[PDB]
Structure 1
Amino acid sequence: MERKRWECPALPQGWEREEVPRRSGLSAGHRDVFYYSPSGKKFRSKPQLARYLGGSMDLSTFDFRTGKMLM
């Protein structure tokens, strides 16, 4: 349970994926997933992400939780 963040190959250049494990409460150990744009904007849901990227690329098979396209 450590924070990890770096480039997401399923998204355009400069986009990054991050996992932050929750450290306390009932949901402790749960891992939230976020994405960051090149400009550093923080995304925490696929609908949010799709309003920025959904025109520029196909997101219909992008799995927000895993960060990969569903083959």
Structure 2
Amino acid sequence: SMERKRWECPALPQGWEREEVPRRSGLSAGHRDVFYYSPSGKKFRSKPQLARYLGGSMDLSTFDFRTGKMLM
């Protein structure tokens, strides 16, 4: 495992990071929320939100927010 993980997301531009935070309690205990951080430390929690920053910069049509990878 229930470890919080955060490091560089290679599917996104230089300096963007991906974080998994497993929930500790409640009905959804064990569910892993996924966040992304910009180079300036802004926190993102959904693909539509992310797409307003990077949608121009790059192609996010096949980016799987949940896994952090482009679908092959």
Fold match by TM threshold 0.5: yes
Residue segments in structure 2 that go unaligned for 5+ positions in a row: none
Cα distance in 1 for partners of 2:44, 2:67 equals 14
Q: Percent identity?
A: 100
**Residue-by-residue CA offset, 1:9-62 (whole Å, 9 max, x unaligned):** 000000000000000000000000000000000000000000000000000000
Structural RMSD (CA): 0.2
SS for the counterpart of 2:50 is helix
Which ranges of structure 1 fall in alignment gaps of 5 or more residues? Answer: none
1:6 CA drift (Å): 0.1
Does the residue aligned with 1:51 lie in a helix, a strand or coil? helix
1:19 corresponds in structure 2 to 20
Scaled by the length of structure 1, the TM-score of the pair is 1.00
- Length-normalised TM-score, structure 2: 0.98
Distance 2:33 2:62 in 1: 20
What pairs with 1:38-57 in structure 2 (closer than 5 Å)? 38-57=39-58
